[PDB]
Amino acid sequence: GRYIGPVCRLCRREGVKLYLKGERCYSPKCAMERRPYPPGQHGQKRARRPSDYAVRLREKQKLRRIYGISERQFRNLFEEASKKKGVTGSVFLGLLESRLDNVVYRLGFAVSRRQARQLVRHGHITVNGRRVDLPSYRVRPGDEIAVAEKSRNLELIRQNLEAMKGRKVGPWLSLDVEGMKGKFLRLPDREDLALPVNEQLVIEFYSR
Amino acid sequence: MLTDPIADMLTRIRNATRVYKESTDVPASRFKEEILRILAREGFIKGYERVDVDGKPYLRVYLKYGPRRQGPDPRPEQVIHHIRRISKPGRRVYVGVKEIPRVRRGLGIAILSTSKGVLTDREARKLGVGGELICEVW
Amino acid sequence: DFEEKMILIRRTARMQAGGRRFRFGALVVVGDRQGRVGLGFGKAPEVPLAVQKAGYYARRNMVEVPLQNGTIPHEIEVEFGASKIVLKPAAPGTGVIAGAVPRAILELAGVTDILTKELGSRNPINIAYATMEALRQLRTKADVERLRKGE
Amino acid sequence: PKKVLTGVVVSDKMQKTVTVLVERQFPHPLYGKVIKRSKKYLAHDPEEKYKLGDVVEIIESRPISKRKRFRVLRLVESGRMDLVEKYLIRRQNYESLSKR
Amino acid sequence: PTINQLVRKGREKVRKKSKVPALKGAPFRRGVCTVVRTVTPKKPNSALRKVAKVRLTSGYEVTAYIPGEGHNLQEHSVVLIRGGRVKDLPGVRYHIVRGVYDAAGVKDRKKSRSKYGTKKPKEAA
RNA sequence: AAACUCCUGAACCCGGGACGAAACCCCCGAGGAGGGGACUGACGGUACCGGGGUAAUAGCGCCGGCCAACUCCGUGCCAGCAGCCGCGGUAAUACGGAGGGCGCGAGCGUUACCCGGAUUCACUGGGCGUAAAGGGCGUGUAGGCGGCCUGGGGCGUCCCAUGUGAAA
RNA sequence: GCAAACCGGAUUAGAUACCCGGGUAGUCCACGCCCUAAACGAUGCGCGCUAGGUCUCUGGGUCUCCUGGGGGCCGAAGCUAACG
């Protein structure tokens, strides 16, 4: 479940570093800079070539990695996105970020993924008034990811706050460090709040 | 015998448009009048007539030849990309509303035979009427 | 300055009272990523020779397509020999989807979304040729007009 | 709504009863082409005031005899026996193929 | 076939013969056993492979092998007919559970314990 | 990765705790409306609210080609692998194991069964000159397809209006 | 005349076969049954349209030609995986 353990050891697996374990995975190493290439005795030989299906697959897996989830719910909601009569892939991308774990991550209140999920699980977060636990929670345009009253009185949360005050929100999710909160709006995309991937590749391998 | 003379007609479309001959010689009927009527009307064929050969009422159709293309051989681009005989003496296919084909998903063109004579795909589409399906071209 | 991209190779061989001498071939396509595409059938003794030379024969056997809205116009089918390929335009939310080589050349073309199936004989070569000519038969409303307006 | 159909009267060979042979239309589900097949409804003629050839209209009713349903309304036309001709020709050709 | 010849006939579907005449869906059927034999995969091999004569809980002999080296049975075992031809024994087919009332993989395998028996090797000490 | 550190609070107990239950009935007007008194909880002190709260199960399959993952002794046409081509006839990435690695995760594999594929029973969608396949040729029976115009019926047809097409 | 099958002969390691001397079924005539066949175009019947350069059976028109159907050479367009 969510891998857990030698996490950003798998950051050299992609060959690419990520905001994954937070602190020790951005600044001078995602376990990177020290050594960036696929783990194991076999890492820096003289690689070959991944077939189209394989590389596109790779891309899909990378997607499930940065979001840190079993491809279960993932894939299911993907075809759910194909159900929505709009351009399947992109619509899917917006409705892909929309999950509150890494949403609250890039919203600020979390350093790492593991963190965000752990916190929301413990009833540490309340969107639009109701305190829950479900991190796999999509949110509609106009909500209010407020934080718990004891979670404002906690410490590393404040650490996450102040180690942020100077970052432009994803132009919709306003940060209320006034009493620890986040105001939710609209629907961005792969052009608004992008990331270094090609979506329709993933899409193209996906359904064959 | 030609119980399917229409088939013979579009047949000579393939023939004459392949061999590239100014205009082809053929027989006549009211249906085929309506046919080349729409055929020329939707800017496809060039002509048709009501002349006589050997004292018999023969129809003759001109063809539409676009710009003279080159390449490893001339072969002027032919407006007759291809035709097709639909309501074969066996498949008396009937059609009306969204029963309308597309042909090239948008463009293309077809023709039909209803109680309202010989119509076309987009035309009978607006019409909100239908009858029987007979031929197609692009 | 284009995008030099390959497809596959061929190991051609035959025997004699001097051994069983081979011969080699390269299947390459030059593609400016988005626009003009070109197939290159290179036949030669040595391998990298055939590679670069099939690249340049791709630089010679050229074509392009009406890259109409990240896809193609009408919807068509083309057979060479006994092998045939199938085609219909698709808006975004579908993507470039076909067999290996088809999608390959379609990326040498810059396609974004297109329905394309394959039927009949399933041999790489004939398939590729069918591709090229099918490319040469993609129109527009404009090309529609020259023919459907009269001369 | 009691359904009726235009049928061709055959077999006067019965007492107060004639048997109508009819042929109905339908294309084909998934192939096309129309079709025309045998169905012989039972024609109820009170005093054999109808007979062979004379095509009439037939009318669905209540069971009047052993399987004999349907009845008869207005006559259509005489001078016939041509359809009948085709019919019994087909009959003999039925009884022209054997496994003996 | 020409429209008419089509209309009359209707091209016979498919009808499958299936690759497991074990009958009444028997990818698990009794196996009572006897004999042993050997034979060879076509030409270049040589081994052993039992012959499990079964009788199912319905009927008949067949040739049932197992996974691999290292048997265990004496008779009976309830060997569950499985189903897969390999490059020999004109049929091969219908392998054995290995676990049930006999067999249970063998004693030395570090992989396919998902049918080669051995619960968890578990170093323990 | 671990180890080491700072961390929250699973599980676990303590205080509380449901909804589902307002009828029916009774009193009132008439036993008609409306209002008002009221039995009524198995589920189960359970979903859940509060407190204290502790770092606390990871396993399966593949690693020759179809497929993404290969380095090392052993095995010597012997022991095994086996969906299809095949691997061992002592330098085996295909058999054993070891390491690392790849797919997945309360899931992982193996087998039985229908179909897309498979346009391989070919309606969109087939073939019979040599790859399956044209009758031994004549022949005409039922059957089907019917050359050019005028009108007539308007069964098949087409659109339009309506009943149904239940619920899920 | 002929020839299975049949006999010896010759040949050969062997000669139930080629090469040899014979000799019947039968080959033929009658009617009848076979109802087979590489019944060969390895290619159903019907109508049409798309180059002709050239020999040829017949039919006609007073004719180097035109023409109505056949016997072939070539190969335009097109079809076959290729030969065709």
Same domain, A199 and A118: no
Domain around B113: 81-138
CA B103/CA B83 separation, integer angstroms: 12
Q: Which residues contact C33 (CB under 8 A, 6 or more apart)?
A: C2, C3, C108, C110
The residue from C63, C83, C107 where one domain ends is: C63
Closest CA to E23 of E51, E50, E48, E60: E60
Do C70 and C140 have their domain in common?
yes
CATH number of the domain enclosing C94: 3.30.230.10
Instruction: Using the CA of C121, give the nucleotide whose C1' is nearest.
Output: G81
Residues 6 or more apart in contact with residue D40 via CB below 8 angstroms: D10, D19, D20, D21, D22
Q: How many domains does chain E divide into?
A: 1
Long-range contacts of C117-125 (CB under 8 A, 24+ apart): C117/C85, C117/C86, C118/C84, C118/C85, C118/C86, C119/C84, C119/C85, C119/C86, C120/C79, C120/C82, C120/C83, C120/C84, C121/C81, C121/C82, C121/C83, C122/C83, C123/C83, C124/C7, C124/C8, C124/C27, C125/C27
Residue range of the domain that includes C37 = 3-63
Amino acid at D25: Q
Q: Which of E60, E36, E61 is nearest to E49 (CA)?
A: E36
Give the residue on B whose Cα is nearest the Cα of D26.
B92
Cβ of B100 near strand F (under 7 Å)? The reply is no
- Number of domains observed in the structure of chain B: 2
CA-based nearest residue to B83, from B66, B97, B63, B57 = B63
Ramachandran area for residue D60 (φ above 0: left; ψ -120 to 50: alpha; else beta): beta
Annotated binding residue at A101? no
- Chain centroid to CA E6: how far? 43
Q: Is A11 annotated as a binding residue?
A: yes
CA distance A190 to C147: 42
How many Cα neighbours within 13 Å face the side chain of E45?
14
- Residue C22 CA and nucleotide G16 C1' are separated, in Å, by 54
Residue-level length of chain B = 138
* CATH number assigned to the domain comprising residue E93: 2.40.50.140
One-letter amino acid for residue C85 of the chain:
I
CA distances to C38, C58, C76, C82, C99 from C123, in Å: 19, 20, 20, 10, 12
Q: What is the spatial distance between Cα E122 and Cα E125, in angstroms, rounded to a whole number?
A: 9
Identify the residue whose tokens are 């209010």: A144
Cβ neighbours for A129, distance < 8 A, ≥ 6 positions apart: A144, A146
Same domain, A88 and A111: no
β-strands D42-43, D35-39: how paired? unpaired
DSSP-H helix ranges across A68-112: 71-83, 88-97, 100-106
Q: Which amino acid is at A157?
A: I
Domain that holds residue A54: 1-96+194-208
Last residue of a domain, one of B80, B95, B114: B80
CATH code where residue C31 lies? 3.30.160.20
8 Å CB contact between A36 and A15: yes
Question: Is the CB of residue A10 less than 8 Å from the CB of residue A4?
Answer: no
Give the torsion sign (CA, A80, A84, A85, A86).
negative
Question: Given the DSSP bridges, would you call strands B94-95 and B131-137 parallel, antiparallel or unpaired?
Answer: antiparallel
Q: What angle do CA A51, A52, A53 make, to 5 degrees?
A: 95
Q: Which residues of chain B have a CB within 8 Å of the CB of C89?
A: 105
Assign residue C31 a region (left: φ > 0; alpha: ψ between -120 and 50; beta: otherwise): beta
Rounded to whole angstroms, how far apart are CA atoms A56 and A144?
36
Q: What part of C 58-97 touches A (C-beta under 8 Å)?
A: 91-97
**A86 and A25 in a common domain:** yes
Instruction: Record the tokens describing residue A37, joined without a space.
Output: 């290439």
Burial E2-12 (b: 16+ CB within 10 A, else e): eeeeeeeeeee
* CATH number of the domain residue B90 falls in: 3.30.1490.10
Full DSSP string of chain D:
---EEEEEEE---SSS-EEEEEEEEE--SSS---EEEEE--EE--TT----SS-EEEEE--S--SSS----EEEEEE-S--HHHHHHHHHHHHHTT----
- Tell me: do B75 and B93 sit in the same domain: no
* Nucleic strand F contact set for E 27-86 (CB, < 7 Å): 27-28, 41-49, 67-70, 82-86
As for how many domains chain C has, the answer is 2
The overall longest dimension of chain D from CA atoms, in Å, is: 50
- Domain with E108, as residue range(s), is 1-125
Placement of tokens 């570090």 in the chain: E110
Number of neighbouring beta carbons within 10 Å of residue E53 = 16
Mark the nucleotides of strand G covered by protein, meaning any atom under 7 Å from a CB.
44, 46-51, 76-78, 80-82
Residues in chain E: 125
* Cα torsion angle, C101, C98, A195, A156, sign: negative
Q: CB burial class (10 A; 0-12, 13-18, 19+) of residue C94? A: buried
| Cα end-to-end span (Å), chain B | 29
What DSSP line would sit under E63-101, residue for residue?
-B--SSS----SS-TT--B-----SSGGG------SSSS
Contact B107, B121 (CB under 8 A): no
Q: Nearest CA to A108 among A99, A117, A116, A118?
A: A116
> How far apart (Å, rounded) are the C-alpha atoms in residues B56 and A194?
75
Instruction: Return the sign of the alpha-carbon dihedral for residues B55, B58, B64, B65.
Output: negative
Method: X-ray
Do C68 and C132 lie in one domain? The reply is: yes
Three-state secondary structure readout of chain C: CCEEEEEEEEECCCCECCECCCCEEEEEEEECCCCCEEEEEEEECCHHHHHHHHHHHHCCCEECCCCCCCCCCCCCEEEECCEEEEEEECCCCCCEECCHHHHHHHHCCCCCCEEEEEEECCCHHHHHHHHHHHHHCCCCHHHHHHHHCCC
Q: Which of C63, C90, C105 is the last residue of a domain?
A: C63
Contact, D52 vs D39, CB < 8 A?
Answer: no
Q: Which residue segments constitute the domains of chain D, with CATH numbers given? A: 1-100 (2.40.50.140)
Are C25 and C43 in contact, with CB atoms under 8 Å apart?
A: yes
d(CA B118, CA C10): 55
Q: Is A25 annotated as contributing to ligand binding? A: yes
Burial-class residue B66 by CB neighbours within 10 Å (0-12, 13-18, 19+): middle
| CA E79/CA E72 separation, integer angstroms | 12
Which chain C residues have a beta carbon less than 8 Å from that of A200?
92, 95-96, 112-113
Q: How far apart are the first and last CA of chain D?
A: 50
Pairwise CB contact (< 8 Å): D33 & E6: no
For A77, the token pair is 């909601």
Number of domains in chain A: 2
CB atoms within 10 A of CB C95: 23
Residues of chain E with Cβ-Cβ distance to B90 below 8 Å are 3-4
SS3 E21: coil
Mark the breaks in chain D: residue after which each occurs, C to N over 2.5 Å.
Answer: none
Among residues A200, E79, A157, which one has the least CA distance to residue C106? A200
